[PDB]
Write an enzyme that holds these catalytic residues in place. Structure first.
Site, short mmCIF file in Angstrom:
data_model
loop_
_atom_site.label_atom_id
_atom_site.label_comp_id
_atom_site.label_asym_id
_atom_site.label_seq_id
_atom_site.Cartn_x
_atom_site.Cartn_y
_atom_site.Cartn_z
CG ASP A 64 41.66 147.44 -26.83
OD1 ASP A 64 42.69 147.59 -26.13
OD2 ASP A 64 40.82 148.36 -27.05
CE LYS A 76 41.63 149.27 -23.02
NZ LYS A 76 42.38 150.50 -23.30
CG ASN A 126 37.98 147.62 -23.74
OD1 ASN A 126 37.30 148.65 -23.65
ND2 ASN A 126 38.99 147.52 -24.60
CG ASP A 166 36.80 149.13 -27.48
OD1 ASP A 166 36.69 149.19 -28.74
OD2 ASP A 166 37.60 149.81 -26.80
CB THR A 187 46.08 149.36 -23.66
OG1 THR A 187 44.96 150.03 -24.23
CG2 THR A 187 46.48 150.05 -22.37
#
Ligand code: A1BB6
Length: 276
Positions: free
Chosen positions: A138, A140, A143, A160, A179
């Site tokens: 995850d 991005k 994060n 995260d 995402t």
């Protein structure tokens, strides 16, 4: 595994909210016995085995297991874990400089040096995780958190770990999907996943850092996912005209559909744009 079931309010005082998610809320807190500050992440538990609301105990335990193993300057650490009937409460290291996402919104786009200053730290954190066979899944800008946003060269931490998984067999074949703008084609196509997916995400982050634009973003989530699967992106001259060919080369070697042909974390650290 069982966590501390004493009332967290007996040991900590909470303050301002630092983040809000689908099944989680984060509040700044202070430990009464030490005066030290942390980020308390309250994760809603599932109320029934056949429920879509809340996080399964299996998912919570996996995240905690991974968090308990990590200790590195570029990754968040876990201080303690509490739980009650409603939530699991992670007491995490406080990173108070805000999201890289918000920092980028303030600058519009970064110079190559500013971008590599951040990227080197992200790569270092991911190198640590991958060395442990941990896929984040995850990555991005939201994060990535800065310790202090008011310094010329901010220090960052990856946060995260809600989708993170140990990859003990080279790949995992589970219900994993982050995402749309940042997921690799293999995630879009529900194929076996490994450490390579994170490297794609890093390519997306790099593109954004240099241009302020998202490479695969469509008007709908389904359009974004279709763009990712087709590797439908290009370097717009309006944004990249004065970006070095070597920066573009770095991105190009990460945004590769076949995970086996994509640069590894070790490769990225030795790439001429990064290697000092
Ligand atoms: C995708 N977003 C989810 C909600 N966010 C956050 C931020 C934090 C955090 C950690 C340490 N210090 C401050 C805040 C945490 Cl613990 N969880 N989610 C921010 C990112």
């Amino acid at each position: 595994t069982v966590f501390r079931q004493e009332n967290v309010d007996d040991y900590y005082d909470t303050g301002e909210e630092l983040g809000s998610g689908q099944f989680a809320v984060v509040k700044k807190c202070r430990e009464k016995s030490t005066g030290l500050q942390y980020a308390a992440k309250f994760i809603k538990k599932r109320r029934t085995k056949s429920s879509r609301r809340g996080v399964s105990r299996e998912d919570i335990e996996r995240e905690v297991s991974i968090l308990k193993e990590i200790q590195h300057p570029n990754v968040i650490t876990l201080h303690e874990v509490y739980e009650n009937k409603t939530d699991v409460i992670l007491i995490l290291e406080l990173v108070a400089g805000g999201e890289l996402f918000d920092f980028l919104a303030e600058k519009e786009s970064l110079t190559e040096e500013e971008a590599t200053e951040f990227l080197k730290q992200i790569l270092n954190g991911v190198y640590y995780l991958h060395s442990l066979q941990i896929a984040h899944f995850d990555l991005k800008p939201e994060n990535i958190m800065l310790l202090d946003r008011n310094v010329p060269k901010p220090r960052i931490k990856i946060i995260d770990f809600g989708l993170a998984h140990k990859i003990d067999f080279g790949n995992e074949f589970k219900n994993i999907f982050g995402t749309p703008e940042f997921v690799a084609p293999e995630i879009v196509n529900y194929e076996p996943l490994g450490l390579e997916a994170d490297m794609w995400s890093i390519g997306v982050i790099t593109y954004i850092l240099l241009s302020g634009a998202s490479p695969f973003l469509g008007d709908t989530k389904q359009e974004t996912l279709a763009n990712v699967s087709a590797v439908n992106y290009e370097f717009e001259d309006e944004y990249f005209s004065n970006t070095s060919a070597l920066a573009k080369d770095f991105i190009r070697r990460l945004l590769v559909k076949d995970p086996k042909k994509r640069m590894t974390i070790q490769d990225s650290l030795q790439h001429p744009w990064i290697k000092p």
